[PDB]
Amino acid sequence: HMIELSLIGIGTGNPRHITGQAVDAMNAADLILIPLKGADKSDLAGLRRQICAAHLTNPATKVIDFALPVRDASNKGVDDWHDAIAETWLSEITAHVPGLEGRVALLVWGDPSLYDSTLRIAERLKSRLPLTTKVIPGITAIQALCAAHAIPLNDIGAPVVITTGRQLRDHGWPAGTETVVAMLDGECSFQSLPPDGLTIFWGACVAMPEEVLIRGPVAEVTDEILQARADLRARHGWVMDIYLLRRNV
Amino acid sequence: HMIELSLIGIGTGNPRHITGQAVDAMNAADLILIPLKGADKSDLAGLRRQICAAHLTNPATKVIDFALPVRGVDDWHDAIAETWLSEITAHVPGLEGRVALLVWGDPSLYDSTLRIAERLKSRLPLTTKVIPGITAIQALCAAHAIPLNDIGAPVVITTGRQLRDHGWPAGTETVVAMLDGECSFQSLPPDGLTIFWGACVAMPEEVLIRGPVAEVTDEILQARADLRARHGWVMDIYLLRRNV
Numbered sequence: 333h334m335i336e337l338s339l340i341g342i343g344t345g346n347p348r349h350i351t352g353q354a355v356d357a358m359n360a361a362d363l364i365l366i367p368l369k370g371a372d373k374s375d376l377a378g379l380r381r382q383i384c385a386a387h388l389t390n391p392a393t394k395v396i397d398f399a400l401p402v403r404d405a406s407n408k409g410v411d412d413w414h415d416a417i418a419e420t421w422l423s424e425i426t427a428h429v430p431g432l433e434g435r436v437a438l439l440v441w442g443d444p445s446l447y448d449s450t451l452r453i454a455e456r457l458k459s460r461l462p463l464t465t466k467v468i469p470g471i472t473a474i475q476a477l478c479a480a481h482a483i484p485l486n487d488i489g490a491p492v493v494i495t496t497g498r499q500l501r502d503h504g505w506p507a508g509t510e511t512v513v514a515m516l517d518g519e520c521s522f523q524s525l526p527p528d529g530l531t532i533f534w535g536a537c538v539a540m541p542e543e544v545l546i547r548g549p550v551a552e553v554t555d556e557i558l559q560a561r562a563d564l565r566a567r568h569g570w571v572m573d574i575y576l577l578r579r580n581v
Numbered sequence: 582h583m584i585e586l587s588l589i590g591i592g593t594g595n596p597r598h599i600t601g602q603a604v605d606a607m608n609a610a611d612l613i614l615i616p617l618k619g620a621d622k623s624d625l626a627g628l629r630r631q632i633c634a635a636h637l638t639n640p641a642t643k644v645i646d647f648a649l650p651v652r653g654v655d656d657w658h659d660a661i662a663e664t665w666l667s668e669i670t671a672h673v674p675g676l677e678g679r680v681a682l683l684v685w686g687d688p689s690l691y692d693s694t695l696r697i698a699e700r701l702k703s704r705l706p707l708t709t710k711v712i713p714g715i716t717a718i719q720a721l722c723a724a725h726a727i728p729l730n731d732i733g734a735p736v737v738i739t740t741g742r743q744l745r746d747h748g749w750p751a752g753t754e755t756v757v758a759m760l761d762g763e764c765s766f767q768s769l770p771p772d773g774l775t776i777f778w779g780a781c782v783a784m785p786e787e788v789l790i791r792g793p794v795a796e797v798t799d800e801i802l803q804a805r806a807d808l809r810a811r812h813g814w815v816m817d818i819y820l821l822r823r824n825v
């Protein structure tokens with residue numbers, strides 16, 4: 333017996349981001365596992381279900397909501413948490429495909445390759461299930477941002493650094509590039525850089541109805557971005573943002 | 582009273598890469614301009630037409646094949662812009678309508694279309710929109726079932742020439758190289774490097790190879806050369822992971 337586990341990218345919140353390949357993988361599944369709404373409102377558990385429902389035409393596919401484990405904030409904590417998530421998946425798969433021969437899908441925001449834990453958690457399962465893992469690409473927040481601003485990611489023939497807010501705060505401007513895209517940033521970390529010669533293309537809730545886009549010289553639009561971000565957060569209870577920095581010195 | 586020009590990403594060769602957003606933009610178009618086959622077989626001009634045919638359902642949308650000018654680079658890009666303008670003038674002479682170009686992968690990533698289209702802003706009453714598509718980076722990682730990044734870590738996306746000119750990019754343990762016609766990972770000391778390589782990713786001809794660079798370099802060279810000999814063209818992409 334063999335479980336085929338598909339990690340299906342579903343894009344950045346625009347329900348039209350889903351690809352035909354993703355639709356096909358949903359329709360081939362015996363079981364689709366989706367997390368229940370929890371504390372993290374940015375998971376948009378309802379939107380995930382909506383996207384699934386808009387395209388699932390296989391009448392036999394089971395769609396099963398499950399409670400995602402909570403990380404122990406009082407803790408290794410991340411490690412135990414990911415272990416617990418794997419255990420939950422393993423229990424769900426075993427309960428619902430007890431013959432252990434079948435196709436199971438998880439729906440992953442954006443693309444599964446990009447700052448997302450699902451693939452590495454799934455690796456834990458390889459030694460406990462007869463398992464093959466497949467990945468279906470989805471639209472990333474990087475591409476959504478560039479499309480919204482109608483800008484290239486790269487300068488002509490030039491490298492690009494993709495990084496995190498914390499990496500920018502710990503190390504400053506990355507070596508060997510004039511373009512940086514920052515993800516996983518909860519604190520507009522570009523504000524800690526020298527603004528000299530930097531242009532920012534910023535977006536919050538990109539490709540969603542709440543989308544806000546701001547562009548300009550970092551020295552001029554930093555406070556505009558801080559305010560827009562805080563406003564969006566106050567009114568919605570959560571915010572996800574991403575930005576591209578272009579250096580011209 | 583505007584030409585709305587959509588640059589529609591169409592993915593890496595798999596017709597199923599097309600997003601719903603791309604389908605919608607195709608169906609909203611009055612005109613879709615697609616290049617005829619040329620000397621460069623890697624453009625897969627026929628495949629672009631087929632991917633369009635698989636998704637376009639509006640019977641009033643007109644798919645028009647045009648001769649793409651050939652290449653110095655500035656003049657070539659100017660000539661391409663002039664060709665699109667001539668086609669738009671010819672097929673939408675009232676200059677009010679929706680026009681689309683179908684761009685391999687995502688329009689943001691190592692593709693000249695977006696910057697060439699900028700030339701038309703001053704020539705037409707123009708609004709430009711971009712529809713994202715699956716990139717070759719994502720297709721490669723998906724085919725190998727691997728993460729792009731190490732946990733919480735930076736990633737460098739670069740070209741074959743930048744890799745040759747500067748060596749291992751500073752500040753990263755992960756590099757993805759695009760626009761490389763010659764396996765430029767050979768220009769690096771192989772110690773501690775692992776490669777995840779793919780040619781013709783997400784197409785029927787797909788070849789995937791992974792392993793320590795020293796171990797699989799020649800395997801990759803031969804597989805690449807074999808594809809190129811049998812098909813007349815090849816496109817490859819790879820991710821390098823350093824552990825030192």
Ligand SMILES: Nc1ncnc2c1ncn2[C@@H]1O[C@H](CSCC[C@H](N)C(=O)O)[C@@H](O)[C@H]1O
Nearest residue numbers: 442443446472473515516537538572573574
């Ligand atoms: N709709 C959206 N708008 C702005 N940023 C977004 C976003 N969705 C995701 N992000 C970015 O992605 C980070 C979550 S990590 C998950 C990334 C996802 N796998 C992808 O392919 O995009 C956020 O901190 C933010 O930087």
Ligand SMILES: Nc1ncnc2c1ncn2[C@@H]1O[C@H](CSCC[C@H](N)C(=O)O)[C@@H](O)[C@H]1O
Nearest residue numbers: 686687690716717759760781782816817818
């Ligand atoms: N099917 C495929 N397999 C392997 N590499 C590919 C590919 N399609 C595109 N590429 C890569 O992309 C380069 C062309 S530049 C265009 C990139 C495209 N906009 C994108 O988003 O992917 C090639 O030199 C190669 O590095």
